[PDB]
Amino acid sequence: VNSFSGYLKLTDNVYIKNADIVEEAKKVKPTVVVNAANVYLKHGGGVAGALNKATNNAMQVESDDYIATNGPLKVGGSCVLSGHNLAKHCLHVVGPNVNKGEDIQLLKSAYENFNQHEVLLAPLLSAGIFGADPIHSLRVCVDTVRTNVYLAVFDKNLYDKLVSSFL
What is the annotated localization of this protein? Predict the structure, then answer.
């Protein structure tokens, strides 16, 4: 049993809800929240900008020190950092950004990072300002992630479309 409430069950392991991932993290304090990161961990906008704002910029401070030490992530890669006031840990995952011309096949590699964590609160990778089709992102998620993933979809319209169209 876990703390996640109000989710629709899509599969054995994948759950979805219309929710603001920031407000959901603040309520649940999950072990892992996933950030929709870029390779530079520059948390300017989208999910990353919202998560970072909710930490009062402490996520960005920690991320800048990580990059200074380790250099940029790979597209499809991840790192584990603090979850600050939102979660125990934040898994920063880099999905391909279609608005930069990155290979959408890298979306499966991105979701494979989730399999290193038994339970996660996450957004749909490469959705929103990363430019991918969220219906495709949900299909890759279901077909790739084997651990228990609770997906937060900010937009009610999109949430209803993802559910209605789910095979």
Answer: Host endoplasmic reticulum membrane
